[PDB]
């Protein structure tokens, strides 16, 4: 969808797991994610859907993948004023 949302309305003001983790696929890899999470999942038989049950059995793990997301939102085009 090239139609950008113009809206003052938040489309992302909450965001779960599911949608977050996939985001962070989209725009860094799993490489990074292998990489700042120091464990073999992301590295190992790279699916969505398998890494989403990891992050809810090893529950820090998903911490951690929640900080990567702050790490894109630090550097991502932040919303200003109303």
Partial sequence: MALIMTQ???PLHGITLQKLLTEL???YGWEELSYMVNINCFKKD???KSSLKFL???DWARERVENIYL???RHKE???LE
């Fill in 46 to 48: 790279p699916s969505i």
């Fill in 71 to 73: 790490k894109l939102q």
């Fill in 8 to 10: 003052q309305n938040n």
């Fill in 56 to 58: 809810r059995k090893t």
């Fill in 25 to 27: 696929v989209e725009h």
């Fill in 78 to 80: 932040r919303n200003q």
